[PDB]
Amino acid sequence: ERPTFYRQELNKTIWEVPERYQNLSPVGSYGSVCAAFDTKTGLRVAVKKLSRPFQSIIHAKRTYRELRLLKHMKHENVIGLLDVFTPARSLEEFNDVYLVTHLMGADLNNIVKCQKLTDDHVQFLIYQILRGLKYIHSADIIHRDLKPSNLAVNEDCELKILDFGLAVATRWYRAPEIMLNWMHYNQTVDIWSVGCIMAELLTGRTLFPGTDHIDQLKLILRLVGTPGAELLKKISSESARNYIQSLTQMPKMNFANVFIGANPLAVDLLEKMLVLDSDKRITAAQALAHAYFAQYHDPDDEPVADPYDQSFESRDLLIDEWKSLTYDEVISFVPPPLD
Ligand SMILES: Nc1ccc2c(NC3CC3)nc(-c3ccccc3)nc2c1
Ligand SMILES: O=C1C[C@@H](c2ccc(O)cc2)Oc2cc(O)cc(O)c21
């Protein structure tokens, strides 16, 4: 049943992987990642060894979540699972988890930080992000942590959304309703991140380089304008309401003055993505229909996900229960077909 494993000390940490995976070679660091050759498919792959996956209730739930998410993602613009394995023979000695995914050249950070991109490159890159977001959103998953280092791009300019990238602060791409600590935000927090990402591709500069959460807000409202009465009446917290309307009434900027000389269609999408009011923000699906993607948009080739059960998220279990649920998911893994 079980293939032949082999051991080695790879820098900081030890690895025991099946003989199928050769030429392990460190690439960085939640857990650490190696590059490898997969003799079975001929692919270069990344093997990820989780750091102490079952050391607390938090880790154990996180390990389980991650594994369920990856097993479920089957889509061109979303990282998926090639293989998952443990060197453990039984539940009793189950203590280490390894995940295998496609290896990609660089992240989006690595392309913008060194250059600009032309308008046709942003189109295709953002198009692919919105296409993967459409699929993730359709399973009632929200990403929450979209930023350049979470977008992997190969030398063909093909893009995949990663669940956790390699270690530019997270807050620079966070929606204002999450800065303010709103408990009830929706899927379009992710649209907000995309708007920030696109903006950064188009101009080469972080749109909102806040030093902290207050600075961040200050920088956001300075482009988008302080909230009107229609938004203000939907804010449940007295203090947030006070902070907001305690501030100087900044007017909304014309985006065409901030993004001078960019495609006027790109400026239009951005207007629709960077709305302070979350209820009005364009969705991923709608954004795919926007004129700016005219040369790529195909409604018969932008699929949605199967139903994803996340009832587990509300459960409070013992470390050994999460551990055993995670073992079941390893055991039942069906490899995706070659081709
Ligand atoms: N329908 C909505 C739309 C936007 C909202 C928003 N956005 C903040 C301007 C960024 N913030 C909040 C909120 C409520 C209580 C505490 C902290 C934040 N609610 C919103 C409800
Ligand atoms: O190729 C990958 C896969 C990714 C990853 C591997 C395993 C996993 O479970 C989640 C993500 O690590 C990366 C990190 C990067 O900066 C750039 C990359 O191209 C990659």
SS3 154: coil
Which of these, 275, 174, 274, 257, lies nearest to 215 by C-alpha position?
A: 174
243 labeled binding residue: no
Residue 173 annotated as binding site: no
CA distance 44 to 56: 33
* Cα distance between residue 274 and residue 290, in whole Å: 15
Report the candidate in 240, 221, 139 with the shortest Cα–Cα distance to residue 183. Answer: 240
Q: Is 23 exposed, middle or buried (0-12, 13-18, 19+ CB in 10 A)?
A: exposed
- This PDB structure is determined at a resolution in Å of 2.4
Between CA 217 and CA 172 the distance in angstroms is 10
Q: How far is the CA of 313 from the centre of ligand 1 (A)?
A: 24
- Rounded CA separation 63/224 (Å): 38
Return the amino acid letter for 243: Y
> Strands 13-18 and 5-10, how do they pair?
antiparallel
Using most ligand atoms within 8 A of CB, pick from 231, 252, 275, 281 the residue to mutate for ligand 1: 231
105 has binding-site annotation: no
Q: Identify the sign of the CA torsion 215, 218, 223, 224.
A: positive
- Asked if residues 78 and 132 have their Cβ atoms less than 8 Å apart, the reply is yes
Rounded to the nearest whole angstrom, what is the distance from the C-alpha of residue 182 to the centroid of ligand 1?
Answer: 6
Q: Are 215 and 206 in contact (CB under 8 A)?
A: no
For CA atoms 271, 272, 273, 279, the dihedral sign is positive
Domains along the sequence of the chain with CATH: 15-105 (3.30.200.20), 106-304 (1.10.510.10)
Angle at alpha carbon of residue 169, lines to 46 and 275, rounded to 5°: 110
Longest CA pairwise span in the chain (Å): 68
How open is the CA angle 110-72-97, to the nearest 5 degrees?
75
Q: Residue 125 and residue 301: Cα distance in Å, rounded? A: 16
Ligand 1 atom 7: the closest Cα is on which residue?
Answer: 177
In whole angstroms, what is the distance from residue 96 CA to residue 98 CA? Answer: 7
CA distances from 156 to 4, 36, 149, 160, 288 (A): 35, 20, 18, 12, 21
Residue nearest to atom 3 of ligand 2 (CA): 103
For 65-84, b/e burial (b = at least 16 CB within 10 A) is: bbbbbbbbbebebbbbbbbb
User: Residue 29 annotated as binding?
Assistant: yes
Contact predicate 125/159, CB 8 Å: yes
- From the CA of 99, give the closest atom in ligand 2: 9
Tell me the catalytic residues: 163
Q: Where are the alpha helices (DSSP H) in 19-118?
A: 57-72, 109-112
Q: Determine the residue type at 273.
A: M
Atom of ligand 1 nearest to the CA of 179: 10
Q: Is 27 annotated as a binding residue?
A: yes
- Number of Cα atoms under 13 Å in the Cβ half of residue 305: 25
Residue 327, CB half-sphere, CA atoms under 13 Å: how many? 16
Report the nearest-CA residue for atom 8 of ligand 1: 177
Q: In angstroms, what is the span from residue 160 Cα to ligand 2's centroid?
A: 10
Task: List ligand 2's pocket residues with C-beta within 6 A.
Answer: 33, 46, 48, 79, 99, 101, 103-104, 107, 152, 162-166
| Alpha carbons 59 and 322: distance in angstroms, whole number | 9
Centre of ligand 1 from the C-alpha of residue 130, in Å? 24
Tell me which residue has its CA closest to atom 18 in ligand 1.
182
**Residue 318 three-state SS:** coil
Q: CA–CA distance from 210 to each of 116, 151, 174, 250, 271 (Å)?
A: 22, 21, 11, 17, 20
Ligand 2 mean position to 46 CA, how many Å?
7
Residue 218: strand, helix, or coil: helix
Contact yes or no for 191/281 (Cβ under 8 A): yes
Nearest ligand 1 atom to the CA of 175 is: 10
Contact 81, 70 (CB under 8 A): yes
Q: Method used for this model?
A: X-ray
Question: Where do runs of H (alpha helix) occur along the chain?
Answer: 57-72, 109-112, 119-137, 176-179, 189-203, 213-224, 229-232, 238-246, 255-258, 264-273, 284-288, 319-331
**Contact assessment for residue 77 and residue 135, using Cβ atoms and an 8 Å cutoff:** yes
The Cα–Cα gap between 192 and 281 comes to 8
Which ligand is in closest contact with the Cα of 109? 2
